[PDB]
Structures are given as C-alpha cells and as structure tokens.
Amino acid sequence: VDGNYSVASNVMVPMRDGVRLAVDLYRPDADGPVPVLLVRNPYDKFDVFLWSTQSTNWLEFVRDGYAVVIQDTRGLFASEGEFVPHVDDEADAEDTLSWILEQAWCDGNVGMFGKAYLGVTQWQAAVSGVGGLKAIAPSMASADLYRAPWYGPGGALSVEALLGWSALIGRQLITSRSDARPEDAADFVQLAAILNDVAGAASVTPLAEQPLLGRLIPWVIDQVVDHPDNDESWQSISLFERLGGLATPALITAGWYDGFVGESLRTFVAVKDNADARLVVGPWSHSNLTGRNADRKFGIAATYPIQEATTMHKAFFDRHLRGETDALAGVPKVRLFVMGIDEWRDETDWPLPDTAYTPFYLGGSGAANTSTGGGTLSTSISGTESADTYLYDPADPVPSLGGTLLFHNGDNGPADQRPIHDRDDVLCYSTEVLTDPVEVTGTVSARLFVSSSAVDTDFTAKLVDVFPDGRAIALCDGIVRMRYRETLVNPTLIEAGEIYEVAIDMLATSNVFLPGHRIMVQVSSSNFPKYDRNSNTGGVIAREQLEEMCTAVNRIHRGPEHPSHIVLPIIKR
C-alpha cells in the first residue's frame, strides 16, 4: 500500500569498535528495496517534534516511498558508548552508511537531512567516501567547527554559544538518566540558571573554571576553552579542506542571523563547482524561524517555508537518489530572502555574479564616538587625516544585541541598536539619508587601520540599517582578535602604539537599504557574550581573572594614508 509505512524502534547498529548505536527505521510498506534518508541526531531520535518543524515534513518522504533512519549518536539516549561532541561522528556515520547499504530494504541510494549539529553530521558523513551516499541537505550548519559555532574567523571564542549549548546537553543527560542521581535535581536547576542568564554565566573569571559544565561535559574545557588557536585538535574534526575533493550534491540552507551562516555559505562555495549544490537563505536566527522579531517584522512569507522546503528536498532526493533527471526543473540554484524589500528572490550563483565589492570609507569632522558623533561613510576617500579614540574596559564590554547570537537572547537577530548608541566606545559612521535604494548582498568585511595601548585587543565592526523612524537594525557583524590578525593558527602579539591594517570578517547579508534609510557601521572592541572579552594583556584569556585584565586605549585611523573602510557587496539592478 503506497502511503503506508511501519516504524521499528531501537534497532541496534554495530560500529567498527563493537559499540552499538540505536536507530529507528521508518520503512514504506512496499516490495523491493527503497532509497534511504539518514538523520544523525544527538537530541533523542524518539523526539522528532523537537527539530522537525525547523527542517521538513519528512513523513512525506516516507509516504512517497523513502525509508528514513533516525539514529541516536554515540553515547546518548538509546545508543551505547561515550558521548564526546564531533570526534566520533565521521567513523560512526561511515559504519552506519555501510550498515544501511547492506540492508534488504536499501536499494543502494542514501541521502541525509537535518539542521545545525544534524547538518554538521552530514558533512562528517560526506567525507567518508561511501559511494552509496548520493546527496546531503545540511541546514544552517558548518564544516569547520572552529569557524562555527565555537570560535569564528576572527579568533574570538563564541562563549554564549559554548555555555548555552553545553547547558542544554547537560539538561538532556540528566533528564535521560536511568536512575536519577542525588545531585540531578540541583544540577538541573543550575543549568537552567545558566540558560536564563547566559551573559552572567559568561562573566565568571576565570572562564576556564566551569565546576558544573566541566563536570557534566569535560570537553567544554578540555577541547573548546583550552584550545583558542585553530590548532591540530580543531583541524582533526574540520571537514572544510576535504569538501573541494567531493562530488556530492548538497542542499544547503542558511539564515542571515543564524550562528552558522558564514560557514554555511562557505560550504556552498566549496562544493558548487563539483556537484549540484543548492542554496536557500532566509532571515532567520538559530532558534527564531518565524520571521517576527521585537522591532523588525519580515512578513509571513519570511516564516521558514516548511512545505516549500519539503517539496524542494523531495525534488532534490528524487533527482539524485532516484535518478529522475528532470526532478529539479524550475528549481533555482540560489534562493535568497532579500531584506529591506523583504522578498524572496532567485539567483544563479552565490556570490552573486555581478557583485561590486565597494569600499565605503570612514570619515567625518570631529570625533565619531556615539551615534551623535560626526562619523560618516562615503565611497570617496576621506580628505583629512584623523583618528577616533576610546577606552575599552573588559569590565564594561559592549553588550551583544541581536546578530548571530545562539542562546543569549538569540531570537532577535535584527535588533534595534539604539540602547548602545550613546556608549563612548561605540564609534558610529553613516551615510547621508539615501534618495535611491542601495542593495548590499554578499560577503561583508572591513579593513581598519587600528592601534592599541595594549599588546593584544579586539576590534569589532557591525553593519546597520537606520530606519526613518529611528530604529537602527543590526545586519551583519564581525570581530578580529588582534593576536590572530594574520592567522588563526600561529598568533603573535602587537606593538603598543603601532598602526595595523587588519581585516574583519563580517559574515554575509542581503539587504536593500531603501530611500530614507542610512547605511551605518559601528566599530568597537567588544561584543559580549556573542564573543568573549579580550583581556588586553596578551595572556591566556580564558585563564585570567577580571582583576588581572587591563583596560586599553584603542584608536581607529582614517584619512588619505589610512583609508579604513567597509567593503560592501553592492548589487545594482
């Protein structure tokens, strides 16, 4: 009977080391083997409602004749073994694919889908070399775990991401326990207190002392906090350098305010030349896919389009797992939600073909401190040599507000920035009010001439759309930790007072700045707890006490010989 299926629970799958991983089998009521879709899930294979609304109506796949396998990853819930994030998923996925391909009901075609960690596990599957894996669909995910979500291209720790995710893993473990432990009730309450105040949890110094999280999941310290350089421990789990050698079609989703967005987009660039890659980017954050935010509404068309996504995934799997050569007819290569005009729009490529990477130079009379300063942005080089100066005090960092926050207030990506506009350490530069629209769609970076009183510090850059009513809406932002200014791998300190030209990777966006709006950039030296705060000492930041940290006098240089600017991907149509 087409449309009908059965579900077998806790089928145990043996890995190479003898440890057995538990799976659930959703198999169509049909004769002969079928194509198979695999989901590798650390959040309980039984709990399908937890994530499915953020992905696909995948029971449609089963009703249409796909088998679907959902697996507890190693050491979690019904699976045997010990859980350590990332380190076992390459080998475990390879063995799981091998097992599936051996099964009577598998016709030799396997795909995958899923979001975030369930997207990462697909890149880890794809590097295995198993020919039966015909396509993946990693949503809002990453193939380089240092660059997202634990650190980033600027070499700062994503501390709210780390502590928030670790606290949810901890609550998961406690809830899933066989026999409740005497300390379970108190631990569970303490993990909730972290999640109710992530910035406060991130404020304890030394950062590396995590009595609760370090006990429940030692990897928090042993791997992430203790390895601030993009060293061999990170490279061991990175998939990115191997993506270029793959020929695996990938249906890649991203969100402009999602923590993974930079790495999601880079996976598309890395695989598009060697197989059929597809890109969908909506205006979502990791936990807010509704299109509605406190001070910014994108319209109901911006809500994560689960039905259209289900249709697109099925067409994708029909093409690559069923060999239906016309199944993707009419489907665009790239589909972006273009903010400002707040409309979905199809494109032929990412980056967009006719992107004009355009410098907008920092300028202005007087000091650019606060939003009532004199800071300007212009496509012409500034005529007079100037500099803006501020005190960065680690005890008083610029609070994170929107952006790509994950767990600390991670449901308000396009946040109004006015609550921090009067801070003296927030330098503001903006264009005149626009009379014609300016579209900025692509990757975004800044190039700043900076100096510091300290031997290490951070610099941040944030792109903002200023609305006529005064809302200053965050778009994309980035950070550079100065010791990593040239390499994330082999950091060196800087000389106090010397001027450096540094790049700040500000991820990506798609926004039409409409007439009556302004383009604005904020520059500072902190963005906390989105990123941990630089101690301004050159020390091992995560091991320092707040008392041991220093303030830094930091300076942006701007003018003819120091043409600090933001590089905007200008689209003109």
Curated annotation (Swiss-Prot):
Biotechnology: Because of the high catalytic proficiency of CocE, it is an attractive candidate for novel protein-based therapies for cocaine overdose, as this cocaine-degrading enzyme could be used for rapid cocaine detoxification in an emergency setting. However, wild-type CocE is relatively unstable, but this can be improved by specific mutations. Thus, improved stability of engineered CocE enzymes will have a profound influence on the use of this protein to combat cocaine-induced toxicity and addiction in humans. Also has a potential as a highly-sensitive drug detector.
Pfam families, A to Z: Peptidase_S15, PepX_C
Description of its domains: It consists of three domains: domain 1 contains the active site; domains 2 and 3 are involved in substrate recognition. Domain 1 contains the GxSxxG motif found in most members of the alpha/beta hydrolase superfamily.
Known partners and oligomeric status: Homodimer. The protein aggregates upon heat inactivation.
Binding site for substrate: 43, 117
GO cellular-component term (any): cytoplasm
Name used for this protein in its record: Cocaine esterase
UniProt-annotated stretches for the region 3: 354-573
Stretches the record annotates as 1B: 240-353
Entry's localization field: Cytoplasm
Keyword terms: Cytoplasm, Hydrolase, Serine esterase
Residue(s) at site: Probably involved in activating the substrate carbonyl and the acyl enzyme for hydrolysis: 43
Function: Hydrolyzes cocaine to benzoate and ecgonine methyl ester, endowing the bacteria with the ability to utilize cocaine as a sole source of carbon and energy for growth, as this bacterium lives in the rhizosphere of coca plants. Also efficiently hydrolyzes cocaethylene, a more potent cocaine metabolite that has been observed in patients who concurrently abuse cocaine and alcohol. Is able to prevent cocaine-induced convulsions and lethality in rat.
Effect of residue 165 to A: Decrease in activity
Segments of this protein annotated with the region 1A: 1-143
Domain of life: Bacteria
Family the entry assigns: Belongs to the CocE/NonD hydrolase family.
Substitution effect: residue 286 to A: Loss of activity
Organism classification: Bacteria, Bacillati, Actinomycetota, Actinomycetes, Mycobacteriales
